[model samples]
Target chain A: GSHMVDMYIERAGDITWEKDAEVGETTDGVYRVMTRGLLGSTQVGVGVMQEGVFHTMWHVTKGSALRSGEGRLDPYWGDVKQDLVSYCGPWKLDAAWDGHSEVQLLAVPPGERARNIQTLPGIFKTKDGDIGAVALDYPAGTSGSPILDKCGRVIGLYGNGVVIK
Target chain B: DMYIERAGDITWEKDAEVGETTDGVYRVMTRGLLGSTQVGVGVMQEGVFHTMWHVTKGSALRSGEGRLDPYWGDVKQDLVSYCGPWKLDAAWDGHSEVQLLAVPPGERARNIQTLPGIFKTKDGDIGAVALDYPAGTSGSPILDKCGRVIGLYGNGVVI
Candidate 1:
């Protein structure tokens, strides 16, 4: 039987991790590791929206994730990237900590059909151990539902079939 | 047709005794009444010499105060004061005719730089001037020909 598991990542300062681990260490030996390097540095390469247009300067830092304190990531071993392969586009992280780590995709506009098949990449830390990736499956319908945080502010991405609800 | 016997003129007799004319024409006169009627005749007069006169002296003469008819005398009313330095307020009623008038000295115009005109009637005594019809409290006043404020214009009844 498949059980649902939830995982989250956020800037460090937002949460107080019971056990603080440096870069390059797998989170609890189950989660992978990655670093966005120093502050003010381009951390991730995101393809924003359906134009295949990519942005390279979305920076992240040590304080960019929260693994403890008031906010922490609930690690799950499920395949997130494989589930979001059909809907692909820009991604954004909102309120990275506060017990709410959200993932967004720039697949389509607010009320349009997914152009490409949405898919999520397999979770893997960078070779330099500064960034993480998760595989997701694609969606199959219109992207009308708003991606919202627990507080209800729209902070995530929407796509066909799959939503980071 | 009776002709004047003399070159200059001839006066008719009050009552001629007989046909005193040498030619075929005879002078006929009949005595009735003359100078017996008043200068101004009323409805009861039955004489041919009746005259009517309208004396406007000392009569309660009243002039039209606000507006006047077309054929009446022209009345001029000077503009007391403008609302402000003229500036376009908003495109009201699908037409951009509404404008803003700054308040005198103390009270500044509300929504001064915004889309709608905010008139601070109490503090600033600011008002607007609109050339449209149906003058109401909220809108501008329609002016009559005599320069009098005929009515207000705008959708709102109260200012």
Candidate 2:
């Protein structure tokens, strides 16, 4: 089994730590640190980058690669498959964000349901082409589910909070 | 592969209001993903109730004038208890900061999707884009501390 992403909630107050951390995009491509203490969710937050798990990187499954401050991103294996060439905030690493927009989706038959493609993490736009929603969190099996709009455009991916359960 | 095959094992049977209510009887309609429509009725005592009848064909993107038989005959366009003085909570930038009237606020607003998702209404060619939300809510009508209906919840985007 791969190392599943572990998110935490700050029990201190109504901060909604995990959800907030997920939404906060510091440098567009640069991910932020999510921690609980001197350590982080997986092993601890101290050693790796001195910051912890960057929000966007939570979706990536890292078994035991770069455990040091110079920890890097494996683009081919990272979310969205984009390279974050330069990064500095938490652990001085390369960052990446698909930051993809202007999707190309075609309209399907009125009764045609989407194939529910397990795809990437991103935003969902409504009929007016506005950022209607953001989806994160991919459970086992349901990982990479693509949300298709009425016209059959790939709008967003299934994330943490959107599972139909 | 495994989970998707048996999605029917899970029953998403909440909120089945299809049309207006009369004399305590409610209307429930379901449009299939394969372009089918079905008419049904709901009677609630404590929990909402509805049963399936015949399945018809049509585009949910299309509209229709619902036909109902005033079975009760005496309730004159009124199921007084079925109607409500509902509230609106559209205080949204269309992005975030909304509460789930269905779930308790303090209990971790699970299933957060922001605004509406890739879906079609009973109308034609309706689609739009993103908005900001306060609490990262999704899939339900958001509300403030009051029972006021703020922004509606919705989804997508993984990590």
Candidate 3:
């Protein structure tokens, strides 16, 4: 629980961006996030989210396990959506770790298949509520938000598979 | 943003709760080995349970008060100032116009500098300031057009 951290990394031209990641269970200080991209990237900074801000904590010396096959990816939008629709049935409650700290509750029944805005890849879009807005109002910086099961356990994460609009 | 990188292990803590109905912004100074460094200002969002403290990790946390101050220095002189006559959402986005007050690096004791048209990018929370600032100018207040504090000038990237 205390391990979750909001990770920021330097991009080309010294631009820093925030993403969701957590400190690894091992004492090696290694951290992990759900991304098929970001492989071979480095210069990661860590901050703990408190009171809606990420407070700086640690910095990553190196990065690995970001390649496509090394970490997990969604099976497919169609298959995953089918499972969600069946498991959640009419409606089910869920919470998403919005950033490094904030947790947002989402009433998940099912979502729609939409064309990805940036890559134009297939995407599974979560609903605002049982049904409302096109997507949940999570921030754009919340890319690595964790998908939670009923018990507040991390079942999945927010990147390539599902988008909160 | 890279300026913040050089700060290394920065320690921070919740600024002390303000009354939910409180109006205006609060100013604080960092008390440390080198005496006091104005760590900029902060504000509690009127309705939202959020606080935006514009401060740098270096001067704000260098020496003096530890533990209680948390962010390195002791948070002495917590004072509130008026935001003139109005208020707005104060929420900003990529490229949002902004203002800044700084003393640059080499020109200390000259005059307080007012920088305008500086904008924020969608990068990290610190992002990249279009203008170049000096080394010791961290914790200067970054203000929105509405005269609200948006962020703090933490560090510099010497590219």
Candidate 4:
């Protein structure tokens, strides 16, 4: 499936999107990771996950529905401000993982109880085999929860309430 | 990381035969463009697949080969040419560590740049490894100390 991509992957996706307020560049930048048949708090952010914390751009989740209530943002990030490691932190996009066996992921499973959450074991498989990946699952309202492997590749993306195939 | 807001390239071919894996689905690079730089991303759920590409490289796409080789020019895969005249350095600030990670798979010292030396984290730790790169390395892929492509460089890539 891959001939020389390993060379190109040194670049690219799902990077951080924040207003370069420092440079005065503003255009509403966060993107949502949730898809159809979605439940209430099914909102999630599938971006760059790092240091037990998730980092995504503000505009990605700019105007989506939220777990607390309807999402709103005075600025682009006002909507999902509390979902990540601060709107002003470091974020990057471009590497869409064609995740292979070489990669592993740290994901959270679905939960609605007022209990706790778990970061489970997830794998990234290049071939779409049956049960391709355990996947980096997350609670509703998940925003940019990255699936980093031992090698530091942000492999899996957490999308709640949405099942593929 | 915000540098890759959306400026790469994503190419995909869905619905193929078994083992028909020409899915040029997702990739971010800095090879062809001559202007700024870019990052591209795509996502899929159910029957629909969504993808978007952003660029600071060129105002329009260059249809032919070496057509836009004027504005910025190619920066040599080997860097032996050393045509471009700018210095840039990249590092990861995650998980707290000072290390080196390079591409062309495992060979680091040759063409790809390597970590000069150890330094304190007054600023903070970058990824497990970092690179002392060129100015045009916006949407490049990065590897771990062992050479596994972990992710892209910090820049553009939303959602």
User: If you superpose only chain B onto the true chain B, what TM-score does each candidate give?
Assistant: 0.14, 0.24, 0.34, 0.26
Query: If both were scored by lDDT, which would come out higher, candidate 2 or candidate 4?
Result: 4
| Residue-wise C-alpha lDDT for candidate 1, range A9-123, written one tens digit per residue | 2121111222222111112111111232324222121111222211111121111232222444322212244222111233322332122143233232212332322222221
Interface RMSD, one decimal, each candidate: 28.9, 7.9, 17.0, 16.1
Q: After superposition, how far is residue B150 of candidate 3 from its true place, in Å?
A: 9.0
User: B44-125 in candidate 2: lDDT tens per residue?
Assistant: 2222111111211111211123232222211221121221221221343444333333222123222222343332322322
C-alpha displacement of A110 in model 4, angstroms? 6.7
Candidate 1: which stretches are off by over 4 Å? Answer: A1-94, A97-106, A109-123, A137-148, A152-165, B1-159
Error of model 2, residue B58, in angstroms: 16
State the C-alpha lDDT per candidate. Answer: 0.21, 0.26, 0.28, 0.28
- Looking at model 1, give its docking quality level: incorrect
Query: What is the overall TM-score of model 4 with all chains considered together?
Result: 0.21
**Cα lDDT tens digits for candidate 3, B63-106:** 22221122222223122222222133343343443455443433
**Best candidate, DockQ:** 2
- Model no. 4, DockQ: 0.01
What ranking of all candidate models by TM-score puts the best one first? 2, 3, 4, 1
Instruction: Give me the candidate number with maximum TM-score.
Output: 2
lDDT of 4 at A6: 11
Backbone collision count in every prediction? Answer: 66, 57, 0, 58
DockQ of each: 0.00, 0.11, 0.01, 0.01
As a whole number from 0 to 100, the lDDT of residue B71 in candidate 4 is: 22
